[PDB]
Amino acid sequence: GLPWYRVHTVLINDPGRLIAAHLMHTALVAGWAGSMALYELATFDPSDPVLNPMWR
Amino acid sequence: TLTYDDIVGTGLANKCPTLDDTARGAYPIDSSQTYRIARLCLQPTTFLVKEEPKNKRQEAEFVPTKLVTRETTSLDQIQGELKVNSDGSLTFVEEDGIDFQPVTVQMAGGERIPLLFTVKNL
Ligand code: CLA
Ligand code: CLA
Ligand code: CLA
Ligand code: CLA
Ligand SMILES: CCCCCCCCCCCCCCCC(=O)OC[C@H](CO[C@@H]1O[C@H](CS(=O)(=O)O)[C@@H](O)[C@H](O)[C@H]1O)OC(=O)CCCCCCCCCCCCCCC
Ligand SMILES: CCCCCCCCCCCCCCCC(=O)OC[C@H](COP(=O)(O)OC[C@@H](O)CO)OC(=O)CCCCCCCCCCCCCCC
Ligand SMILES: CC1=C(/C=C/C(C)=C/C=C\C(C)=C\C=C\C=C(C)\C=C\C=C(C)\C=C\C2=C(C)CCCC2(C)C)C(C)(C)CCC1
């Protein structure tokens, strides 16, 4: 069969499943953004923009 | 004249009585007469808490907070002697009443600041 590093080429001639795959990727990235924001908000101390800003 | 049923659950019970705009008069003090306050009421509208100074050690400011304990905040039915002093100044000496309320206000960032809002032994 297909080697492991070629598994995704099945989408090359399957525009619908390729769109599906792009949707999933996009979902993962947006989910990441949401979760990163949540974690940062769960750890960020907003109490000192002077000496403790976000970049610190 | 409003009854309990008119007031209950409206929030008005936590409001102090108001006087209309024409009330800019003067109440004479007879320095030979003894006086009392029959009802003193205090209705807070804003609670401010002094932010803890970053370490800059400049002037820390009082910041707004959000009331979370609802309309449970007013001091009322407070009564006491109103003494007339020899220099003609008046001194209120709180004796009794509902002269305290526990209050929790919440700061930016979520920190809750409980306090005993009071005029006890005023
Ligand atoms: C838009 C970005 C993009 C896209 C859509 C593709 C699309 C594809 N490439 Mg890839 N490729 C890309 C960028 C991209 N490539 C880049 C930047 C490189 C340089 C490293 C390569 C190198 C590359 C090679 C060398 C090959 C492909 C091949 C493939 C195809 C099969 C993929 C597969 O089956 O993997 C299956 C993959 C796995 C089962 C696991 C991979 C695990 C990785 C290595 C580690 C974990 C990755 C992690 C989850 C991703 C985080 C996201 C990242 C951006 C930070 C497929 C058409 C293959 C191909 O052409 O097939 C005929 C192939 O031979 N690509
Ligand atoms: C953008 C991400 C992405 C997308 C859209 C696809 C899309 C697809 N993959 Mg690919 N795949 C991916 C990533 C992705 N894959 C990665 C990273 C790997 C390496 C593990 C593989 C390995 C893979 C294989 C081996 C095969 C496919 C195949 C397929 C297709 C059928 C779905 C399937 O079999 O899933 C299989 C893939 C997975 C179930 C992904 C693994 C899940 C990882 C471990 C993360 C799970 C999230 C988890 C809850 C978080 C963990 C947190 C941790 C801190 C504990 C489908 C087109 C199949 C295909 O059609 O081949 C012809 C196929 O056989 N995929
Ligand atoms: C009306 C014209 C039109 C429009 C507006 C789009 C719009 C877009 N195309 Mg599509 N496309 C079109 C015609 C059009 N295409 C045609 C004629 C073809 C040839 C068949 C394709 C083939 C195509 C492919 C192969 C792919 C796209 C993808 C994308 C999207 C990439 C941006 C993205 O995902 O943002 C993120 C998304 C959002 C911020 C949400 C947008 C809200 C959507 C539009 C509402 C969904 C409801 C709607 C009624 C149903 C789908 C609408 C459809 C016309 C796109 C995007 C939605 C890609 C994609 O779908 O990947 C995920 C992709 O892979 N397009
Ligand atoms: C514009 C930015 C961008 C781009 C170009 C891509 C591009 C792509 N993403 Mg990625 N992604 C992005 C942003 C981006 N992503 C973001 C912001 C997120 C949220 C964190 C994700 C999350 C994400 C996930 C979860 C997945 C992808 C996958 C993929 C690939 C799908 C096509 C494939 O089959 O490749 C085949 C794979 C390759 C060609 C290898 C890519 C190697 C990268 C560039 C570096 C790998 C680093 C190292 C070897 C392993 C990681 C370290 C480890 C300790 C964790 C593709 C390369 C999917 C994929 O990789 O499936 C296999 C997949 O699983 N992406
Ligand atoms: C640490 C581990 C814990 C994590 C667990 C969480 C997820 C558990 C579920 C995993 C088990 C999947 C069983 C496979 C189902 C199946 O039938 O496959 C085939 C199905 C179609 O159904 C099928 O389709 C087949 C043909 S075809 O694929 O349509 O061509 C056909 O054989 C069949 O009749 C039909 O039913 O299509 C697929 O190929 C999808 C399988 C890939 C699923 C793995 C992805 C999991 C990651 C998702 C994370 C989301 C991220 C958030 C972003 C929003
Ligand atoms: C965040 C989500 C994370 C989930 C994703 C999981 C990540 C999966 C990573 C897959 C990588 C597996 C590696 C495939 C390894 C393997 O299968 O290779 C053998 C493979 C042969 O494949 P073929 O083309 O012959 O086809 C056979 C098929 O059966 C393959 O499926 O070649 C390749 O895959 C190219 C890479 C070669 C790599 C060679 C390096 C190894 C040599 C020794 C290195 C260490 C010693 C050095 C001493 C100094
Ligand atoms: C479905 C449903 C629901 C739910 C959803 C959810 C529950 C959510 C989500 C999302 C999510 C929550 C998930 C996810 C994401 C994550 C990610 C995607 C991350 C990434 C990772 C990677 C990719 C990276 C790698 C790294 C390593 C790890 C280390 C270092 C190096 C690097 C950087 C490479 C709702 C209500 C909405 C509605 C609709 C439907």
Q: Can you describe this structure?
A:
This is part of a larger assembly, with chains A (56 residues) and B (122 residues). Chain A is mostly helical. Chain A is elongated, with a radius of gyration of 20 Å. Chain B has 122 residues and is mostly beta strands. In chain B, the strands form 3 sheets. In chain B, strands 1-5-6 form a 3-stranded antiparallel β-sheet, with no helix packed on it. Chain B has a 3-stranded antiparallel β-sheet with strand order 4-7-8, with no helix packed on it. Chain B has a two-stranded antiparallel ribbon with strand order 2-3. The two termini of chain B are 31 Å apart. The interface between A and B is small, with 5 and 5 residues. Bound molecules: chlorophyll A (4 copies), the ligand CCCCCCCCCCCCCCCC(=O)OC[C@H](CO[C@@H]1O[C@H](CS(=O)(=O)O)[C@@H](O)[C@H](O)[C@H]1O)OC(=O)CCCCCCCCCCCCCCC, 1,2-dipalmitoyl-phosphatidyl-glycerole and beta-carotene. The site of one chlorophyll A has 5 residues of chain A, from α1. The PDB classes it as photosynthesis. The entry lists the keywords Photosystem II, continuous diffused scattering, molecular transform, resolution increase, photosynthesis. Macromolecular diffractive imaging using imperfect crystals. Chain A: Photosystem II CP47 reaction center protein. Organism of A: Thermosynechococcus elongatus (strain BP-1).
Give me the secondary-structure topology.
This is part of a larger assembly, with chains A (56 residues) and B (122 residues).
Chain A: H1 15-43
Chain B: H1 4-7, E1 35-42, E2 48-50, E3 62-64, E4 66-67, E5 75-84, E6 90-98, E7 100-106, E8 112-118
Antiparallel strand pairs in B: 1-5, 2-3, 4-7, 5-6, 7-8
The complex binds chlorophyll A (4 copies), ligand SQD, 1,2-dipalmitoyl-phosphatidyl-glycerole and beta-carotene.
Residues 8, 25, 28-29, 32 of chain A line the site of one chlorophyll A.
